[PDB]
Amino acid sequence: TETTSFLITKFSPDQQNLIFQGDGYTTKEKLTLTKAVKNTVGRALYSSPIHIWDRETGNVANFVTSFTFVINAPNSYNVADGFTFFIAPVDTKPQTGGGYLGVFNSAEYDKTTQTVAVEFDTFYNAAWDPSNRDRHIGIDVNSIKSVNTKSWKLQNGEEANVVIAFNAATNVLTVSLTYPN
Amino acid sequence: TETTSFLITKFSPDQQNLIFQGDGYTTKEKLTLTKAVKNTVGRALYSSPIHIWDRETGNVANFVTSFTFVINAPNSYNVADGFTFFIAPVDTKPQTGGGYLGVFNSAEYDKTTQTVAVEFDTFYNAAWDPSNRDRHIGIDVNSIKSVNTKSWKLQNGEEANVVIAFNAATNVLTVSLTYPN
Amino acid sequence: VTSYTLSDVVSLKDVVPEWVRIGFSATTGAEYAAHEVLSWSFHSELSG
Amino acid sequence: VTSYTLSDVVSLKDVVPEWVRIGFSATTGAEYAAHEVLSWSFHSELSG
Numbered sequence: 146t147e148t149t150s151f152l153i154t155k156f157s158p159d160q161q162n163l164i165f166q167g168d169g170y171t172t173k174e175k176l177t178l179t180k181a182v183k184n185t186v187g188r189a190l191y192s193s194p195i196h197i198w199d200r201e202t203g204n205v206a207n208f209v210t211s212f213t214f215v216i217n218a219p220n221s222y223n224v225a226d227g228f229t230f231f232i233a234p235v236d237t238k239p240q241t242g243g244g245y246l247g248v249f250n251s252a253e254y255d256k257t258t259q260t261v262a263v264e265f266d267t268f269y270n271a272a273w274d275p276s277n278r279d280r281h282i283g284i285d286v287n288s289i290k291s292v293n294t295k296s297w298k299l300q301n302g303e304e305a306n307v308v309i310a311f312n313a314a315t316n317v318l319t320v321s322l323t324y325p326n
Numbered sequence: 327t328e329t330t331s332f333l334i335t336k337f338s339p340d341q342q343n344l345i346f347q348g349d350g351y352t353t354k355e356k357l358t359l360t361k362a363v364k365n366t367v368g369r370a371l372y373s374s375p376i377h378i379w380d381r382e383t384g385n386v387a388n389f390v391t392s393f394t395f396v397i398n399a400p401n402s403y404n405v406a407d408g409f410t411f412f413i414a415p416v417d418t419k420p421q422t423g424g425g426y427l428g429v430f431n432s433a434e435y436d437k438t439t440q441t442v443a444v445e446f447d448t449f450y451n452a453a454w455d456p457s458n459r460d461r462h463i464g465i466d467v468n469s470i471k472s473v474n475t476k477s478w479k480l481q482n483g484e485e486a487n488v489v490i491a492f493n494a495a496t497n498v499l500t501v502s503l504t505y506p507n
Numbered sequence: 508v509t510s511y512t513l514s515d516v517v518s519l520k521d522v523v524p525e526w527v528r529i530g531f532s533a534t535t536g537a538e539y540a541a542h543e544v545l546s547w548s549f550h551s552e553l554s555g
Numbered sequence: 556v557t558s559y560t561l562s563d564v565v566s567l568k569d570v571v572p573e574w575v576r577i578g579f580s581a582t583t584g585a586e587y588a589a590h591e592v593l594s595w596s597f598h599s600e601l602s603g
């Protein structure tokens with residue numbers, strides 16, 4: 146058996162168990178990925194590689210993650226592009242920006258990306274987002290065009306409580322998001 | 327609040343969550359620090375830095391670690407040098423070998439070493455080890471000359487179950503080594 | 508309290524490598540916003 | 556069942572850095588032996 150766990154409720158100015166990329170850094174006890182500025186990207190990864198599956202045994206891990214995030218937009222009606230929780234190869238660097246969320250490079254399925262992500266998409270990209278134009282939660286598998294989505298009403302400046310779990314017995318990835326109001 | 331935890335009941339050949347130094351590597355479900363050869367050193371560290379204390383609050387972490395280790399000496403009368411569990415700066419490299427156990431460089435207090443180690447010392451180094459010449463467990467603080475020791479009867483080839491815990495409320499570090507026989 | 512849920516079947520072993528790193532990402536384009544995380548916990552268990 | 560116990564006061568805050576890495580070491584010199592680890596677990600909690 147192999148397990149990896151951690152908890153952080155307040156971020157230090159030098160949170161050494163995290164790897165930062167782009168504009169990602171800690172400030173005011175929070176983990177900031179981007180400030181309200183155009184065309185940028187920020188990522189933060191846990192320092193330790195995580196053992197998700199094993200070829201010889203074919204065993205796959207069960208895992209769960211909890212986090213609370215906030216999106217602060219100057220104009221509550223002009224918001225982009227979104228935020229994700231992702232699982233990628235150990236040596237991952239920021240991918241395409243903008244609507245690609247720094248984790249994918251195309252709407253076409255790309256086996257080489259080897260990345261799974263749960264997105265909280267605040268901007269409608271006509272090339273691949275749900276036609277109703279709603280902001281949405283989505284499950285992405287090697288593509289920015291989600292395998293499944295659910296419409297989500299962004300609450301500007303409100304704390305979004307998220308839980309994401311993976312059940313290896315069923316290969317089911319579940320996502321939950323709650324707002325206090 | 328911050329917590330870090332992990333469990334490895336058996337090592338895999340590609341243990342990516344560990345950093346290996348010197349002769350250290352994983353094989354046959356075990357972690358090999360040294361083989362039975364002279365003048366060598368092997369170390370393995372957990373990949374993620376751990377937050378032990380915070381300057382602003384002055385808070386110090388409580389922690390516990392458990393592990394099972396084995397020493398196989400080709401002889402019953404000539405055994406050296408020992409094994410340690412250590413806490414050191416994030417970017418630590420192997421220190422002096424032999425009687426220094428790869429964690430210290432002198433028997434004199436050196437504040438720059440910034441390392442605490444629990445040693446399982448199998449060889450009597452006259453310059454600093456307990457005069458009774460017994461193998462012993464010791465608590466080392468910035469020096470190979472332990473602040474406290476306990477005579478220990480090495481059981482060649484037997485599994486030793488160790489538990490090391492630190493109580494932040496009292497600053498007490500406790501160590502226990504248990505053999506089934 | 509306002510809640511949302513979403514789930515799907517993802518053959519993890521066929522998409523990501525045996526070992527991975529996990530993390531968060533956020534981007535802006537012509538339109539923007541600040542994205543922040545207040546707390547984070549994670550736990551994984553792989554059997555032998 | 557043979558147990559050995561040892562304890563002492565150690566002001567960690569005055570010895571090691573705020574952040575540390577933990578690990579195992581083993582060495583040999585003119586005399587030697589094989590040193591191996593079979594299993595390992597760790598848990599820490601810092602409450603501020």
Ligand SMILES: OC[C@H]1O[C@@](CO)(O[C@H]2O[C@H](CO)[C@@H](O)[C@H](O)[C@H]2O)[C@@H](O)[C@@H]1O
Pocket residue numbers: 225226242243244245268270535536537538539
């Ligand atoms: O104002 C958004 C507007 O800009 C375009 C390019 O002209 O898209 C950019 O901005 C989006 C919002 O941040 C990103 O999703 C996209 O990746 C970026 O190129 C238009 O497509 C969009 O209507």
Ligand SMILES: OC[C@H]1O[C@@](CO)(O[C@H]2O[C@H](CO)[C@@H](O)[C@H](O)[C@H]2O)[C@@H](O)[C@@H]1O
Pocket residue numbers: 406407423424425426449451583584585586587
């Ligand atoms: O055979 C032991 C003998 O070797 C010396 C050096 O000549 O010490 C070396 O070996 C010890 C046992 O492994 C180490 O602890 C020591 O660091 C290393 O120099 C003699 O001092 C010792 O009597």
Ligand SMILES: [Ca+2]
Pocket residue numbers: 226227244266267268269270274
């Ligand atoms: Ca989008």
Ligand SMILES: [Ca+2]
Pocket residue numbers: 407408425447448449450451455
């Ligand atoms: Ca010694």
Ligand SMILES: [Mn+2]
Pocket residue numbers: 264266274275281283289291
């Ligand atoms: Mn989308």
Ligand SMILES: [Mn+2]
Pocket residue numbers: 445447454455456462464470472
């Ligand atoms: Mn000693």
